[PDB]
Amino acid sequence: IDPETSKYFSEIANLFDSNEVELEERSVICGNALEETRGREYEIATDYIISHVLQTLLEGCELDQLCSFIRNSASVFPAIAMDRSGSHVAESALKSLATHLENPDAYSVIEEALHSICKVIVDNPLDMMCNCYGSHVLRRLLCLCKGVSLDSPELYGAKSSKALAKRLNLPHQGFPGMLTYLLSGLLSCSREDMKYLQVDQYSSLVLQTALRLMLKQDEQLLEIIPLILRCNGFHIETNVAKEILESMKDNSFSHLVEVILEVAPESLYNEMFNKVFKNSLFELSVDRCANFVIQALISHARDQEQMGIMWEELAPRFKDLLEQGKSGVVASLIAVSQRLQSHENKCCEALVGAVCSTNESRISILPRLLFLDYYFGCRDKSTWEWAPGAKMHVMGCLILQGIFKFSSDHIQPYITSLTSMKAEYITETAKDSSGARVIEAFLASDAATKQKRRLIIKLRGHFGELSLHTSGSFTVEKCFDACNLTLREAIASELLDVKVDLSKTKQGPYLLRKLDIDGYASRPDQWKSRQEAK
RNA sequence: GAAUUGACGG
């Protein structure tokens, strides 16, 4: 890295800043500058300063020069990818490649570039799989081979509200032979190396990504998963099942088996259910790591026999799970009960009994789940009633949202409890970003109209303030849609009083328009006639 | 629109 090389890439960088360069000329300069890297790919790409310029060049050049850079750097690509700066250079090369996925003329030239990369990785993959930087490069490479260009937290694999909502029940072809080739290369180690891969954070993350990209590819999943579990008809031998069970409380492995259970084909799921989990459900549910594996197991159960086993092992202990901070386990059991149509009423009753012991407690099932952590962390639970001002409990509210997807037959204690909360509590619930989802699930449930109406009426006087927030505005429209003319008019006039402020809100203009607040203000008789025709 | 209780970068 002589100073002339340094001056060159710095001068290229300033030239792009000064935005005096046409986008077509910019693209050609990017290509010329890449040629200045030939023979020095590793040195340029891993330089703490020049790597950032090399990212700019890769993202601004044309396909041919990108491919030329990838081909000339392939023999050092694992070294670039495991470097703390070079790994961003490597990822820029992939994002750049990915911008051409929609161009059918580019198919074979992209595939050749991926082959250069996969070939040198497959030759020696295990340290790159476990390297904190190279693991990000492998995840992106796997996505590209699948034809996925657009980043997804799920695939990489972060937690997200789409995934939580999915767990609770609320396309380019790619380069399939390159995906198979690379992922087979990552998995052709000894069973004893694989044991360590199960438990290394960074390699577990790579395998999580690969499993998600193979979703619904049963023939590949049935080859891949047994290698990862060290099983290679699919059968888990008794000693291997013990080893999988023993590793289940590990933070890295627990994340991996979460994904395995999500993508597992039916026959493979059933074998895992029976041989690994079947008599350990509660012990695994109380572990800080394993309980998320149990949530994934619960969510993907196939049939009523499995539902019964999970019921027998876990419902008697619902109170333990809530006390110990494992509400996600209960949420999942409740959610899959409504999905498999099994043990619905047994699940709902076990939840009531877990929160409300004596008969007098049961009218408080709703407040206690809205503030699940305050009630269970309470000093004196026989006097606890509310958490004034507190933020409501995400998972307690998600449980309730599942509860209100049951038929009214199974959830009468929940409907009676919610609809009988006093106005101040119902109002605080609607103003909470989680509690508003509870209200909305109840308005969408098949509870009686009279009962919905009772709750909505206790919101009178607060629709204006409710509407001034993004979450409340949805609740206001859900209440409105559920109302007769008398209450639609009540809500409409409350929004009128706050119409100035409401219009300065993100959602306000839409809400004002959907409810037709201007018509109501200016020609109320015609607004009432159009609403009545609904 | 609130998004679990246990991980990730120059």
Distance measured from the CA of protein residue A294 to the C1' of nucleotide B9, in angstroms: 30
Token pair, residue A434, equals 């989680």
Helices (H), A61-125: 63-73, 77-81, 86-98, 107-122
Contact (Cβ atoms closer than 8 angstroms) between residue A441 and residue A434 = no
**C1’ B9 / CA A124, Å:** 22
CA-to-CA distance for A244 and A229, rounded, in angstroms?
7
Does residue A194 come out as left (phi exceeding 0), alpha (psi in the -120 to 50 range) or beta? alpha
Structure tokens at A278: 């079947």
Q: In angstroms, how far is the first alpha carbon of chain A from the final one?
A: 74
What is the identity of the amino acid at A334? I
Q: What is the DSSP letter of A289?
A: T
Helix (H, G, I), strand (E, B) or coil at A163: helix
Q: Residue A133, SS3?
A: coil
Asked if A276 and A235 touch (Cβ cutoff 8 Å), the reply is no
Exposed e or buried b for every residue in A381-405, given b needs 16+ CB within 10 A?
Answer: eeebebbeeeebbbbbbbbbbbbbb
Which residues 475-534 of chain A have a CB under 7 Å from nucleic chain B? 475
A333 in Cβ contact with A296 (< 8 Å): no
How far, in Å, CA of A94 to CA of A74, rounded? 13
Asked whether residue A85, judged by its CB, lies under 7 Å from any atom of the DNA or RNA strand B, the reply is yes
Integer Cα distance of A471 and A306 in angstroms = 38
Which residue type is seen at A67?
C
Q: Obtained via which technique?
A: X-ray
| CA-to-CA separations, A292 to A254, A285, A355, in angstroms, rounded | 7, 8, 22
For residues A72 and A75, give the distance between their C-alpha atoms in angstroms, rounded to a whole number. 8
Q: Give Cα separations from A525 to A432, A486, A511, A529 (angstroms).
A: 34, 13, 20, 6
With residue A454 as reference, give the H or E element that holds it.
helix A449-457
A34 touches A92 (CB < 8 A): no
Calpha distance A301→A363 (Å, rounded) = 32
Query: Could you tell me if A268 and A223 are in contact, meaning their C-beta atoms sit under 8 angstroms apart?
Result: no
Structure tokens at A253: 């492995």
Task: State the Cα–Cα distance between residues A299 and A331, nearest whole angstrom.
Answer: 10
Query: Tokens in use for A329?
Result: 């386990």
Q: Residue A466 has which token pair?
A: 């409710």
How far apart, in whole angstroms, are the C-alpha atoms of residue A17 and residue A497? 50
Q: How far, in Å, CA of A378 to CA of A36, rounded?
A: 67
Identify, with chain letter, the residue nearest to nucleotide B3 (CA–C1').
A161
Q: Pseudo-torsion of CA A21, A25, A27, A33, nearest 10°?
A: -90
Q: How far apart are CA A517 and CA A496, in angstroms?
A: 7
- In 3D space, the residue among A501, A493, A481 whose CA is nearest the CA of residue A518 turns out to be A493
Q: Of A207, A221, A145, give the one whose Cα is nearest residue A176.
A: A145
Q: Which nucleotide is nearest to A331 (CA to C1')?
A: B4
- CA-based nearest residue to A401, from A371, A364, A435, A428: A435
- DSSP classification of residue A393: P
Other beta carbons within 10 angstroms of residue A68's beta carbon come to: 17
Q: For residue A289, give the nucleotide whose C1' atom is nearest its CA.
A: B6
Distance (Å, whole) CA A245 – CA A273? 11
